[PDB]
């Protein structure tokens, strides 16, 4: 119930539509963080450098439309916080986004 | 009986329309449009089937350097017909027609639109192809 690892496909285009060229990929990171805070109610969201490279693979202007994210709520390690649990955000390499559901994978 | 509806206008004061008859004139500089009241900073413009004041810029010396009355037949600006078609032409064309309505030339090159043909009967009689 608390330790839940599960898959999602984020459509970056419907959140990135509207912003200018030098402010597309950091805004995409910000809406991925807001998406993680939206599904999982944890303010402590730590996104992975592999997903950083996956968003910033093309450039700052051309951002990929759909992306595949393993979202995992985890119990907090030492250096304790008032936030009781955190959320790790991981990239999953998927070739084509045709009929990809939000698959709830098991540990 | 049947009055002329409004159409789109795209030939203000300054346009040189080509003269589509066998008089000898090549160009017609529009100097003013007959039948416009006017308003501050508005150029008088003539569409299809408009009585206009023209001047032969180049052509025969008997036609140059004097004011003629003209009727604008063809325009390039797309204008809306009443049945719902936007018929537009290749060039901007007019003929020299006196104050009563009789033409000066005999034949008319190019097609004459029916908005001009219903208004001017003597131009429609000399025209072979209509619209």
């Amino acid at each position: 119930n608390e330790v839940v690892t599960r898959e999602y496909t984020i459509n970056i285009h419907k959140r990135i539509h509207g912003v200018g060229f030098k402010k597309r990929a950091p805004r995409a990171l910000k809406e991925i963080r807001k998406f993680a805070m939206k599904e999982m109610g944890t303010p402590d969201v730590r996104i992975d450098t592999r997903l950083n490279k996956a968003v910033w693979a093309k450039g700052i202007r051309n951002v990929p439309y759909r992306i595949r994210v393993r979202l995992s709520r985890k119990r907090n390690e030492d250096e304790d916080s008032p936030n009781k649990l955190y959320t790790l955000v991981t990239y999953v390499p998927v070739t084509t986004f045709k009929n990809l559901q939000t698959v709830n994978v098991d540990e | 009986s049947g009055a002329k509806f409004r159409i789109s206008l795209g030939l203000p004061v300054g346009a040189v329309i080509n003269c589509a008859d066998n008089t000898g004139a090549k160009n017609l500089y529009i100097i003013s449009v007959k039948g416009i009241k006017g308003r501050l900073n508005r150029l008088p413009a003539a569409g299809v089937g408009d009585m206009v004041m023209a001047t032969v810029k180049k052509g025969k010396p008997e036609l140059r350097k004097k004011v003629h009355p003209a009727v604008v037949i063809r325009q390039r600006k797309s204008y809306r017909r009443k049945d719902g078609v936007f018929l537009y032409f290749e060039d901007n064309a007019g003929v020299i027609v006196n104050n009563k309505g009789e033409m000066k030339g005999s034949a008319i090159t190019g097609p004459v639109a029916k908005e001009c043909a219903d208004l001017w009967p003597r131009i429609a009689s000399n025209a072979g192809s209509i619209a």
């Binding site: - | 009986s1 049947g2 509806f5 308003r39 900073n41 049945d83 719902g84």
Partner: protein, 394 residues
């Protein structure tokens, strides 16, 4: 000195309070005048602007060049669900003003009308009309209501009816229904109040109010455009390129010796979101909505006597930013004020309308139902499939 070349004024003094309107629903400022010779009927209605399409019809006017020709005209689709009557109100006539006397609500009032009395429906305990609905199943409350109606028989002059829209059948996101007063103009006060009590807690469709080829008035709020400049709002002449301090501005406000700026000076401010009342709109067709009998549903709303097709007025892929029209609708000449999903007031004509253009009987030929979302080129799904053929996905 004087102005050299005199010019007409940019703007109108009749509309100069160009502020954002407080009310969002179009309020009727003046209803049509009553007469006891005419029977009782509703004089207003509250629709919702769905979309826009073409029309094809024959023009019957003697003398014109356009006589017996197939013109096209812009029409507005207004989805008009039948409204629920949930109360009445009487009006006494005072020398100070036409004052509301006593408002009598209904017993069973739907939750769509319950949404209007609350600003926040989630935190509210849904406890409205609870002590008021107890007056309809007791002996003393019925006597008090009969005394109220018997006073309204005597002293009331104008009787308006309270009707709210049916938002559940509408495809909009909101569920809060709009309420509206509609003045009934007809016979005497007693017969009018008896007919209103008979129509209490009832549906009111559109064909009982309006008819074919009737000139109506459209009340509505302008599409909002925000804070705009004076060139964008008042449509003034632009200053040339060489101006240092801006060119899409007003150069001169006024004279020296008047030490103030006049009220007629075109300034920069609010453009859009204005309450307006346009007159003389012509109804071409009051279309029936979706109805189900003998299993399959009947949806041929765009079918005319000359088209003989099964298509509806819903275009390919639905209307742009509105949804699909399932309810009964009306179709007006020209364009009406307001954007998509905007509430829109219909009203009967104030002026006694007897004109040759206004008394024309419209016979429809073809209704364009193509995809307005983009450059559409097909009328219906089966025609598109018959033209394209078997696809890769099929």
């Amino acid at each position: 000195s004087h102005r050299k070349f005199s010019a007409p004024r940019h703007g109108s003094l009749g509309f100069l309070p160009r502020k954002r309107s407080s009310r969002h629903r179009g309020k009727v400022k003046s209803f049509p005048k009553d007469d006891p010779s005419k029977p009782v009927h509703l004089t207003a209605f509250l629709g919702y602007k769905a979309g826009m399409t073409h029309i094809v019809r024959e023009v019957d006017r003697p003398g014109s060049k356009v006589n017996k020709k197939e013109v096209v005209e812009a029409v507005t689709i207004v989805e008009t669900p039948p409204m629920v009557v949930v109360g009445i109100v009487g009006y006494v006539e005072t020398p100070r003003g036409l004052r509301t006397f006593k408002t009598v609500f209904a017993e069973h009032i739907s939750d769509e009308c319950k949404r209007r009395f609350y600003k926040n429906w989630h935190k509210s305990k849904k406890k409205a009309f609870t002590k008021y609905c107890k007056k309809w199943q007791d002996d003393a409350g019925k006597r008090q209501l009969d005394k109220d109606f018997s006073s309204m028989k005597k002293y009331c002059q104008v009787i308006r009816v309270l009707a709210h829209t049916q938002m559940r059948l509408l495809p909009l996101r909101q569920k809060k229904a709009h309420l509206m007063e509609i003045q009934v103009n007809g016979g005497t006060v007693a017969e009018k109040l008896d007919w209103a009590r008979e129509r209490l807690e009832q549906q009111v469709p559109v064909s009982q109010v309006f008819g074919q080829d009737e000139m109506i008035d459209v009340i509505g709020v302008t599409k909002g455009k925000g804070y705009k400049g004076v060139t964008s709002r008042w449509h003034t002449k632009k200053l040339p390129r060489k101006t240092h301090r801006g060119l899409r501005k007003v150069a001169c406000i006024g004279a020296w010796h008047p030490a103030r700026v006049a009220f007629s000076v075109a300034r920069a401010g609010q453009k859009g979101y204005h309450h307006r009342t346009e007159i003389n709109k012509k109804i071409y067709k009051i279309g029936q909505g979706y109805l189900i009998k003998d299993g399959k549903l009947i949806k041929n709303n765009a079918s005319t006597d000359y088209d003989l097709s099964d298509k509806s007025i819903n275009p390919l892929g639905g209307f742009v930013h509105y949804g699909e029209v399932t309810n009964d609708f009306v179709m007006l000449k020209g364009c009406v004020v307001g954007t998509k999903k905007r509430v829109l007031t219909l009203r009967k004509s104030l002026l006694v309308q007897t004109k040759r253009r206004a008394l024309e009987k419209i016979d429809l030929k073809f209704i364009d139902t193509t995809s307005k979302f983009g450059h559409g080129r097909f009328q219906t799904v089966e025609e598109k499939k018959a033209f394209m053929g078997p696809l890769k996905k099929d």
